[PDB]
Design a protein around this nucleic acid. Structure first.
Length: 51
RNA sequence: GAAACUUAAAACCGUGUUGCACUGCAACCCGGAAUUCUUGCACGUCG
């Protein structure tokens, strides 16, 4: 600490899901599911290998 | 004694640099102080 500046330690444990949005929304033409797990590939790496 | 100009003519003139050498020069910070800062949940509403 310091003799005029007093810090603390704020710890947050989530009991439910937490969503802090970024302003970004992804369409269905970027990901595709496999059972329950949905895969998010890199958008430029799947374009570079395609001829 | 009464009567007849020591007069006439003649430039104080000719030639000649107020000229020769000489740095308005030497030394000197446009320098010292100053937060592009203060407030703000990527969120609300579901026959």
């Amino acid at each position: 600490m310091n003799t005029y500046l007093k810090p603390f330690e704020l710890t947050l444990r989530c009991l439910g899901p937490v969503f802090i949005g970024s302003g970004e929304k992804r369409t269905s033409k970027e990901y595709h599911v496999e059972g329950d797990r949905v895969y998010f590939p890199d958008m430029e790496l799947l374009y570079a290998d395609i001829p």
